[PDB]
Amino acid sequence: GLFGAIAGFIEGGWQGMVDGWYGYHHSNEQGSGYAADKESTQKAIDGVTNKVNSIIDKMNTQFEAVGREFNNLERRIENLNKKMEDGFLDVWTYNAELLVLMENERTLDFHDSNVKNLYDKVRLQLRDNAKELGNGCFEFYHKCDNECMESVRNGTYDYPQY
Amino acid sequence: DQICIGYHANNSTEQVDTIMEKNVTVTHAQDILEKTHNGKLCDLDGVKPLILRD
């Protein structure tokens, strides 16, 4: 992906994080587990929801064909009518298919971005109080108990304290 | 002791297309095209049609 996180330096996703799209896995002396970053997650849900509704709604006004009939000596205008109706169907078919392709690409990249930013958010808190392992993980120099871990997820990680 | 960043995966086989890649497996997708019909001529909002038959 464009942002290098998903299927990049973070090799794979987590079956074990069920509760959100992005989040944290912690590991210390007390144990280990997954925790979803709900805010980043809810941001993503609002964006994707709006997108879908934007797509659905933009295609709201669109060409509606009507039945028109013509006799045996009106072949020219019958052909015109047919070319006209087919022409608009092809145009709207193109618009729909291309919009889906373009916005699918942007949706996948959007998720990649949200992950990259969540990773950097944590990196920028910890700074040189942890080893950046290069795989999505940060190994602490100090012991980091569950409250310590929570403060990382908080945005509250007190850097001067360590 | 360590903390790691990651993302959701699941058992989904739903696929979507993009410009640069086709058949990308995603965790979730939403179909927006109705493909089926009941194969019958019906009352429209309760008001029966005029069926001229032959």
Epitope: Q15, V18, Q42 | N11
Partner: antibody, heavy 128, light 101 residues
Framework: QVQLQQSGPGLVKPSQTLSLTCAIS??????????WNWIRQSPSRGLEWLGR?????????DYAESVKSRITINPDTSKNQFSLQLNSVTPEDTAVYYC??????????????????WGQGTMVTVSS | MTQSPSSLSASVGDRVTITCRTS??????THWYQQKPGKAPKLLIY???SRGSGVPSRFSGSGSGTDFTLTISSLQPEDFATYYC?????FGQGTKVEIKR
């Protein structure tokens, strides 16, 4: 429709182990679109989520911080049930215990922890 | 999660609104339950505003930032209950709706 049928004794002596079972019908304990939870309720403490188990290419458990050192929740894929075990009970563990399914209803495939089906409840009294 | 009021009396046909102020605002995680005495809770609303299966149209939910609301447009006798809001694994304390004389 999914039904959850609870069982287990409603009387536990102090310091001993509370043991409950939830038997599932209409769904699989190992379903990818289910999460299996225990929640308790007491007049004092209100509604309290205790823990869960679920299967996603392997079994996972999460437990509430308040009970983490005493609690075990195990699936049984032979009998399509899951259990609650709570060790070293005290009077404060007196409550109605409910099993409940979550993650059946998801926003964009993400379990939001919205419980959609609950068992009937087992009233548990800690007393000698 | 803080619910207000902790209880209320309203007559049949009344418009009823209950509020939950959450620690932090997420629309998708918030949910509402209705519990009648001695029964399990029933899911009423999920993700702030989606009606649960089999839940009648008089119930709706709204969310703005950290404030979430459940509204019963026209109270019926059967809506005597305690209503709870919830996010992630945290519940509000509940609101008792009694049917006021």
């Amino acid at each position: 429709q999914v039904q959850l049928q609870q069982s287990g004794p409603g009387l536990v002596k102090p310091s001993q182990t509370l043991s409950l079972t939830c038997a599932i019908s209409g769904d699989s304990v190992s379903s990818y679109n289910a999460v299996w939870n225990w929640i308790r309720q007491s007049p004092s403490r209100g509604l309290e989520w205790l823990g869960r188990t679920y299967y996603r290419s392997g079994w996972y458990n999460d437990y509430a911080e308040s009970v983490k050192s005493r609690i075990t929740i195990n699936p049984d894929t032979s009998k399509n049930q899951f259990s609650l075990q709570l060790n070293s009970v005290t009077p404060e563990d007196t409550a109605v215990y409910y099993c409940a399914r979550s993650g059946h209803i998801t926003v964009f495939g993400v379990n939001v922890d919205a419980f959609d089906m609950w068992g009937q409840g087992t009233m548990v009294t800690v007393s000698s | 999660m803080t619910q207000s009021p902790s209880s209320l009396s309203a007559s049949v046909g009344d418009r009823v609104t209950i509020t939950c102020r959450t620690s932090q605002s997420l629309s998708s995680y918030t949910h509402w339950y209705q519990q009648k005495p001695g029964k399990a809770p029933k899911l009423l609303i999920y993700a702030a505003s989606s009606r649960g299966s089999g839940v009648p149209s008089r119930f709706s939910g709204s969310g703005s930032g950290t404030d979430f609301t459940l509204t019963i447009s026209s109270l019926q006798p059967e809506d005597f209950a305690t209503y709870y809001c919830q996010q992630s694994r945290t519940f509000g304390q509940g609101t008792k709706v009694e049917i006021k004389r």
